[PDB]
Amino acid sequence: MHPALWVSKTGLDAQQTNIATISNNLANASTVGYKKSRAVFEDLFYQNINQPGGQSSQNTELPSGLMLGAGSKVVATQKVHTHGNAQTTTNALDMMVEGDGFFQVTLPDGNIGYTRNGQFTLNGEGTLVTSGSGYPVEPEIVIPEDAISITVGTDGEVSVRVRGQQDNQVVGQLTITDFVNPGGLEPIGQNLYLPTGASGDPQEGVPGLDGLGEIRQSMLEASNVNVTEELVNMIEAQRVYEMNSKVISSVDKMMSFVNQQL
Template identity: 40%
Template sequence: MKILGIAATGMQAQQVNVDVIANNIANANTTGYKAGRATFADLIYQTLEREGTANADGTVRPVGVDVGLGVRATGVVRLNTQGGLIQTDNQLDIAIDGDGYFIITRPDGSNAYSRAGNLALSPEGEIVTLEGNLIEPAMVLPNDVQEIEITQDGLVLAYTTDAIEPAEIGQLTLATFINDAGLKPIGNNLMLETAASGEPMVGNPGDEAVGILRQGYLEGSNVDPIKQMTDLITAQRSYELGSKALKAADEMMQTANQIR
């Protein structure tokens, strides 16, 4: 009786689905978070009767008897749609409006990529993430800076105490990927390049296929709470059906054992 294994694979798949949905709901207010969606595929089939075989009377069987062996999770697809822009009026909050990722230097010197633009200044005046990681290209602001302006095309300008005109500090760049769904999330709003994502293509904000920057805004999560709750109910019902299938299989086996 294959129903035990088949039902178990369905319950395992729905558990993955519920985990993904729960993570989406938990990150509904995470800056720059992109919702994930679990995807599934049916497992191999056991052929009891082959399609197209000849019957004893000379006719051809139009369909076969192929019994599936269940389901498996094939991946979690990240939905890279634009999140809503939230106005903060903080001069170091920057939202990416369009495609692209901030380039972040990790403590080990490697690069990671992020959509979260809630930035800050280090004690040395460097522009860093809230975890203290440097934004690439690295730039240092003067000690007497009074105001920071970041243009849509990524130019960073600093207004100091006595200067009439702002000083040009540097140029922010963004990275884009052929398949940004292939980036590997590692937490702290960071993602890593993989063989699936392809190599980063670095450009200035506003270049072709690169988004622009919005100073004083943050990109909100693209999670739709109503849809997530609907998906959660559907996954819960599917899990319950799997448990009922296991219970039915147990009752069928008990009935078979009682036959004398």
């Protein structure tokens, strides 16, 4: 009924998506290996009532046309994959990737999911699995029951100390996957990503060569959210949200006044 009524509604919808992304970052302020997100805004199409640079009624180019906007929206959610701070723990099964790389796990469907979370443990059979839902880690690392300690090398080599034997036995070799565009991965929850068309081909190799990061044992990767930034972004989003409601209220009063008068 009024263009300003619907233009400001797009502003209201854009802020609701913006606030939902901010609330997600603050909720995941203690999640291990969580990469924060930011909403990407962009204007909608402009109605071309008058052509800029087009000839006018007196054959003069218009230095600026009458182009009416349609509002704004959130078009994408970009995850900033900067490395987070390191937490020093005493667990011998939680690891961290110093540099680009994702641990690979075997999903129940069969596909491979890529995770930055390093909190791992063992199942009943001794295979290295995730500390959450319990998915195995690719490649499978079987810890024998005669081991007394676990050491994970810088290049992902897993070794176990066995009593009665010098020269600790190597039981497996871990590999990590990097992506050209990790921000193009599909977050499926559970600190797991799925490869996509724009993510790029997975590049797998030893953790420490060809640009791949190194694995550090007994260390966890903190979330990269800026708690102060999310509070300021909440201040901005709340006020812009309210100001768009001001326009809808004013347009409502205008249409109400017209009905009583006209």
